[PDB]
Amino acid sequence: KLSTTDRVVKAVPFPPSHRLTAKEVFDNDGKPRVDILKAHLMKEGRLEESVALRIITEGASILRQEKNLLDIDAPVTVCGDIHGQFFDLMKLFEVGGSPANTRYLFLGDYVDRGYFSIECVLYLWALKILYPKTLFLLRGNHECRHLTEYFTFKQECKIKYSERVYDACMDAFDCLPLAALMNQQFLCVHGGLSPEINTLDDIRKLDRFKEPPAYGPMCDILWSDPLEDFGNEKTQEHFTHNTVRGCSYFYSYPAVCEFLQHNNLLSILRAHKAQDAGYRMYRKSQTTGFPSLITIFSAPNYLDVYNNKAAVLKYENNVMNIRQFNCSPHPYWLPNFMDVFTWSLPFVGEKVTEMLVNVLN
Amino acid sequence: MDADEIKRLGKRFKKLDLDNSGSLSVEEFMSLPELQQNPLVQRVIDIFDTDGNGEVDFKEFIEGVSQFSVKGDKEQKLRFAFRIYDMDKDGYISNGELFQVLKMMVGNNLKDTQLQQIVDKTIINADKDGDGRISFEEFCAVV
Amino acid sequence: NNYLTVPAEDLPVITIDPAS
Ligand SMILES: [Ca+2]
Ligand SMILES: [Ca+2]
Ligand SMILES: [Ca+2]
Ligand SMILES: [Ca+2]
Ligand SMILES: [Fe+3]
Ligand SMILES: [Zn+2]
């Protein structure tokens, strides 16, 4: 009958066990081979620890030289949360364009929730090494030690690589810029505004090479949210305690409009919030006639249950083109990277005990 | 084992031996209503069938329950659980049998693609000598 | 429990390209 040694579902490719070496990941010039890396990571392949550490540290060195507030000219494809959905990230670049001929800006949250977070980091960092001046990465609230230890990113690193690789990621995440000034019109951040931030210079004078503090303007950039009644403003306070995140604040429609007018900004582009269509246009500013706030979310079918769309924002030729895309298949992991023996053994001992009890009566 | 237990198991063995053949067939095990929906019945029967004739004689029936004695340490519980997965009884858990045994337990709770993927991952993450199969030592380190 | 289960210039114009 069915072989006890050969694989039953032969349609599933057996993942490669080899770990790529430095000579196989970096070419003669020292540039990463993103084609090799993409194909290998899509098969759930792994790199040698030293190679993974080299990608993380080399990418961190490029990030380390960048300012807190990036200056990015149009055209550019702005992207929201990825949350470790590496196979949806492959679809994202198909939708937005290849980084070989397309400028990109990512608003953070590359890790946690999805179970391919380290693949997302390695591939984005390699792209950052390859395209240091056309592909840009901002920091999200999940690129920190506080959250990756509470969620699955640290466990993911220890299963696929080592805690040393995790530790290298934490130091790299500290180098991530906090914000971007895009085409002199849009302030691009992960979370939103801060009561301690009223000008662009308030962002520039920040010290970002650290773990995000529990309070302060750096925390607010990464954690803040618009009011649930944004636009329908009955709460006349500009900043109130964020009861959903447990820290930072909610910011109101008057707060955003005042900031935009004080800094001559058209809109604020942010992420940090799952959306059914992958995007949300907030109430227009009476001063500009343009939406004061835009949320972008690039993780489709979030947590494999939300069944939401994802979108990126392609700004080119004075056109704000929203591009939606659906989720893609990905290999299956048991929750919290549990193996099948630890998963099934309590069921095994239970059913064999029931049988023995009913046979012996 | 205990003499009182030996006599009780002989009485139960007779009630299970419906055709009075001196050996328990798979159909005779399935006659019990609690075992009709237990997805591990066929695995335990094969484990007890140490000679491979498809049936369980009284000698196999005694030695099968002897392993479930309270005088067995945790290793005795893990060795029996190991044999649940090791269908071909070669001392190792291979890919096909691990999938098949898991498929019996999960039924429709996982599609075949998803199950094959986590079976692959477990074998890769647990095989420490490169043979491609999971020995009992490798099985202990995981559980 | 009969089966093992899984554990728990002018203004910019805004345009849309729906999925697929
Ligand atoms: Ca019989
Ligand atoms: Ca027999
Ligand atoms: Ca075997
Ligand atoms: Ca082995
Ligand atoms: Fe976030
Ligand atoms: Zn997020």
Side-chain angles (χ1 to χ4, degrees), chain A residues 2-233 235-361, chain B residues 1-76 78-143, chain C residues 1-8 10-20:
Chain A
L2 212 49
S3 177
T4 60
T5 56
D6 300 329
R7 302 171 66 252
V8 174
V9 186
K10 297 181 181 300
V12 176
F14 190 68
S17 302
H18 165 85
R19 295 178 169 262
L20 300 186
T21 64
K23 296 180 180 177
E24 303 169 350
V25 173
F26 301 86
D27 59 5
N28 298 18
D29 298 327
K31 310 192 305 295
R33 307 147 70 114
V34 297
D35 296 353
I36 301 297
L37 195 65
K38 173 171 68 178
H40 186 70
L41 289 175
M42 287 187 301
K43 301 177 181 70
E44 291 175 298
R46 299 173 182 178
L47 323 178
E48 289 189 350
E49 179 158 330
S50 69
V51 183
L53 289 176
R54 179 174 166 188
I55 289 180
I56 299 170
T57 56
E58 285 192 15
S61 297
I62 293 183
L63 295 170
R64 182 174 290 114
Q65 319 299 124
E66 286 178 334
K67 301 123 60 182
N68 295 2
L69 180 61
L70 304 174
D71 298 321
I72 303 173
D73 291 333
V76 61
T77 301
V78 190
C79 314
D81 298 21
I82 303 303
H83 281 304
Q85 302 176 202
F86 173 83
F87 295 84
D88 299 313
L89 175 70
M90 304 294 94
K91 184 63 173 183
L92 179 154
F93 287 117
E94 184 175 343
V95 171
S98 179
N101 53 79
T102 307
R103 305 157 52 88
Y104 275 94
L105 171 62
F106 288 81
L107 299 186
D109 280 5
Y110 317 105
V111 303
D112 291 330
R113 300 306 197 172
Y115 284 169
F116 310 97
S117 294
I118 189 57
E119 289 84 355
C120 294
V121 174
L122 292 170
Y123 189 67
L124 287 173
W125 261 242
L127 291 169
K128 183 60 174 168
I129 297 167
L130 192 57
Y131 308 106
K133 291 307 174 181
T134 55
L135 189 138
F136 300 98
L137 305 169
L138 292 190
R139 195 177 192 170
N141 65 294
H142 283 263
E143 280 71 47
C144 70
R145 303 159 184 82
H146 184 244
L147 271 63
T148 53
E149 291 158 13
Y150 177 80
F151 294 102
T152 62
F153 181 57
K154 184 179 180 179
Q155 173 77 347
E156 180 181 341
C157 288
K158 295 179 65 60
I159 268 62
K160 300 178 178 180
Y161 292 91
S162 67
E163 187 160 344
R164 188 174 301 99
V165 170
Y166 171 79
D167 289 335
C169 287
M170 298 302 101
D171 299 326
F173 289 167
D174 296 341
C175 308
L176 277 169
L178 299 180
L181 177 62
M182 194 271 277
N183 200 67
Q184 301 286 95
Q185 294 176 309
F186 309 98
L187 169 63
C188 310
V189 298
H190 181 74
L193 286 182
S194 181
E196 312 186 21
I197 293 182
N198 306 113
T199 61
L200 295 187
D201 274 323
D202 300 329
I203 300 178
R204 296 187 179 92
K205 311 308 172 185
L206 296 178
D207 180 24
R208 81 180 194 261
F209 305 91
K210 66 175 65 177
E211 174 82 4
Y215 68 100
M218 180 173 172
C219 171
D220 299 330
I221 288 181
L222 305 182
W223 281 91
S224 59
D225 285 311
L227 276 171
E228 195 63 51
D229 290 357
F230 192 93
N232 308 119
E233 294 297 332
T235 308
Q236 301 187 17
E237 314 181 36
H238 284 28
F239 293 93
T240 57
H241 177 63
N242 193 319
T243 54
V244 182
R245 309 291 182 177
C247 62
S248 182
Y249 306 89
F250 289 116
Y251 45 88
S252 65
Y253 172 79
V256 175
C257 293
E258 170 183 334
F259 183 89
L260 296 176
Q261 194 171 10
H262 190 12
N263 294 279
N264 201 23
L265 298 171
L266 187 54
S267 182
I268 290 180
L269 305 187
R270 48 91 64 168
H272 196 38
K273 188 65 176 299
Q275 301 295 332
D276 295 330
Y279 69 98
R280 173 163 171 179
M281 303 282 168
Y282 292 82
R283 182 179 173 194
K284 289 187 177 179
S285 184
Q286 309 180 38
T287 309
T288 69
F290 202 80
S292 63
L293 189 65
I294 298 180
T295 293
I296 190 69
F297 194 75
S298 309
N301 192 27
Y302 188 61
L303 295 175
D304 296 323
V305 282
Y306 274 61
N307 198 26
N308 66 284
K309 302 284 173 294
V312 300
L313 188 29
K314 166 86 75 174
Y315 189 61
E316 182 170 15
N317 296 328
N318 204 34
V319 175
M320 194 75 92
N321 173 231
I322 308 287
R323 291 182 182 176
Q324 299 174 287
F325 58 101
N326 271 313
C327 74
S328 307
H330 61 77
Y332 182 69
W333 270 100
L334 287 176
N336 295 115
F337 303 91
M338 179 182 296
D339 64 286
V340 299
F341 293 123
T342 309
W343 171 43
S344 60
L345 197 57
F347 186 81
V348 166
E350 166 186 333
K351 307 308 290 183
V352 303
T353 297
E354 295 179 10
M355 175 186 180
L356 266 296
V357 166
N358 300 131
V359 161
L360 304 185
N361 264 18
Chain B
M1 53 169 59
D2 184 18
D4 302 332
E5 304 169 6
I6 292 176
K7 192 166 64 176
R8 293 193 239 95
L9 296 190
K11 303 173 185 175
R12 280 299 301 182
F13 191 90
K14 287 176 170 57
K15 178 176 172 55
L16 301 170
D17 189 18
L18 296 181
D19 62 355
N20 198 28
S21 66
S23 305
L24 303 184
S25 68
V26 177
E27 298 80 358
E28 294 173 343
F29 273 103
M30 298 302 178
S31 299
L32 298 180
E34 301 85 357
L35 278 66
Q36 301 170 351
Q37 293 176 322
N38 193 333
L40 290 179
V41 172
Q42 180 57 43
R43 285 310 305 149
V44 176
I45 292 175
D46 191 60
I47 290 178
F48 286 6
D49 187 17
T50 57
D51 67 82
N53 66 332
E55 294 184 345
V56 175
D57 54 69
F58 184 78
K59 176 178 58 180
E60 298 168 338
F61 187 85
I62 286 292
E63 303 183 27
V65 187
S66 304
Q67 303 166 356
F68 276 78
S69 178
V70 299
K71 299 303 178 181
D73 300 68
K74 186 54 66 63
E75 170 165 314
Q76 280 65 38
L78 290 180
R79 290 195 181 274
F80 185 88
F82 181 87
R83 267 118 65 177
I84 293 287
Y85 306 96
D86 189 16
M87 291 179 59
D88 53 15
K89 302 178 174 186
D90 67 352
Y92 306 95
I93 303 177
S94 300
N95 194 283
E97 55 189 5
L98 178 58
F99 179 94
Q100 290 177 234
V101 173
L102 283 166
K103 187 59 178 182
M104 301 171 184
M105 294 181 290
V106 308
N108 302 333
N109 289 338
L110 279 182
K111 300 152 66 176
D112 288 352
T113 296
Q114 299 174 307
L115 183 57
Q116 182 64 82
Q117 289 172 335
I118 57 177
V119 167
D120 288 349
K121 292 178 186 63
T122 291
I123 281 180
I124 295 175
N125 295 331
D127 191 19
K128 303 302 178 179
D129 67 333
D131 52 7
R133 48 198 180 175
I134 303 304
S135 71
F136 178 73
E137 292 84 346
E138 297 165 341
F139 177 79
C140 287
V142 178
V143 306
Chain C
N1 293 330
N2 295 6
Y3 292 91
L4 172 66
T5 59
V6 184
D10 198 6
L11 218 59
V13 181
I14 305 173
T15 65
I16 314 176
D17 296 337
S20 303

